[PDB]
Amino acid sequence: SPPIINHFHFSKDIKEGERQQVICGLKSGDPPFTFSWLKDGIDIKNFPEINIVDVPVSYISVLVISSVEAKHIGNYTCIIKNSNGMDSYTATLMMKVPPRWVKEPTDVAATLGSRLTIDCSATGYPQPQITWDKLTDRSEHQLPVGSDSQRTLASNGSLTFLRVDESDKGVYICQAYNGIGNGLQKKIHLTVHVAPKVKEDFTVITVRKGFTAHLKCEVFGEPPLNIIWKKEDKIIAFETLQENTANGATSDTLINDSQQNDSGIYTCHVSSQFGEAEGKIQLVVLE
Amino acid sequence: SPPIINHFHFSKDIKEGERQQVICGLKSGDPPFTFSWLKDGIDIKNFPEINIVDVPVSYISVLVISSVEAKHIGNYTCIIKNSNGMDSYTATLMMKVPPRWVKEPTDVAATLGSRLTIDCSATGYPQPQITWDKLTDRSEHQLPVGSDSQRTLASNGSLTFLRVDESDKGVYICQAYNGIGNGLQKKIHLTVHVAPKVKEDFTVITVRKGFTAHLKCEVFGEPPLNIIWKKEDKIIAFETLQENTANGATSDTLINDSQQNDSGIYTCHVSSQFGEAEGKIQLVVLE
């Protein structure tokens, strides 16, 4: 009689680490038998991390997978053949992974005119889809952002602004979904901020020799602002005062007793998280 | 005197699970002091999974991150202010993850004329780029596949064929790279196979009543082929012979002693891993 096969199945909620064994046994049929395994039409000898245990004395053969990586997903077929015919049965290895964050987005503070790039990554099986929705406080409604002119969404869901504008403020949301679970969703607040600017590009300070020369450098910006003075690309150690204000700060620094080798140009450099600026103040000591 | 800050730094080869602490302490400066923390221009009160330990008696404040998820990457700034000025210092939290396979590709056996979709996924930081190169055995050289007409590479590196052709045989390679390490590379063998076809769509078998009616159904295909006969969508249990060949198999089945309620149409259905076909054989019993 031809062989008939006992239906077999893989576990239900399979996870990457787990092992899996499926037994191909007989209902009926006269020996001798020959067992044979396939995965999606390819023979199982190919995949060596899969090895099959066969005990033909007991009329069975077992497929084993010691650790199920998602490549194992697919259809596995066992074929039993004798000198009267063959039976076969296929079982499906199924696996689902809901999204987990790779790169969560967070609240962002962007520089106007800069080229911002927010990242938002996630992983799972299938590979999750990353979508951005901005919240319009005209009625707190979601509207998908998308790759406009002056905007971009790269291969991996990274939202990139070409020139940041006051238009691009408020709260945004990226959403990772692959069909498993509800997915992920992250709401972030974008705020726009202005790069610092020295009020005056370059001012002349002229004095007679040997006086308390008084330098000046107020700058516009958002606190904090950290100002460093220089001469010919060397730091000034001399006495320096740095009083703050609201729209920035002013730096009043003075050099006591002037010299003709000190006469030249100086550099008021300011640094911040939103940019950096430089004013070059020049000094000449007349007789 | 204005406060001056002791430079601090995050660990060098940071990994997701680890904790990170950075101490903002003073070199010099006269009290009282006020400590303040920022991340990329945003204040640290926002991120609550970050909490700061501050002990102003010892002139220090510590930022702590109990488990560094990649969102923590960026620049952290500590600001110390007194009634003479402020100092500040920023340190960068850096993290790299080389690619690991999410969905490894494997050897594939495609049906001609079908719409194949090979998957190839990977994960890491930054999110890896997935590229396909086919090996031309004209000189075993790589050539990037790309989204042709009759081909496609989806968002996540899934290579999709619209109509599979003999053109699309041989070994291919997908390569995952994000800049860290050398990345990953996987070489797979594509082989093309033909869906089974019943030789004859529908044949008339006519006999007189009460004879050993002899049915016939050879089919073309690649082994294995599993044939099931039916009548009005019910299985035939009756005597059936299924002898194989090279290009497929033939199924010679016979019904002993005919009846007028048996007279009708029958269905030779074949199933395989590369497709399924049906021939409808018809029977009429004349007097």
Residue numbers in the entry:
A (entry chain A), B (entry chain A): 0 to 236, 243 to 292
Article, verbatim:
Recently, a shortened Dscam (sDscam) gene family with tandemly arrayed 5′ cassettes in Chelicerata species has been identified, which encodes ∼50–100 isoforms. Chelicerata sDscams could be classified into two subfamilies, sDscamα and sDscamβ, containing one and two variable Ig domains, respectively. Furthermore, the cis interactions were established by the three FNIII domains of sDscam, which assemble into a cross fold with a kink between FNIII2 and FNIII3.
These crystal structures of Ig fragments were determined at 1.3–3.1 Å resolutions. Similarly, sDscam Ig1 also employs the ABED face to form an antiparallel homodimer. The trans interactions of Chelicerata sDscam were mediated exclusively through the Ig1 domain for both sDscamα and sDscamβ subfamilies. This finding supported the functional significance of Ig1 in mediating the trans recognition of sDscam, which was consistent with our structural analysis.
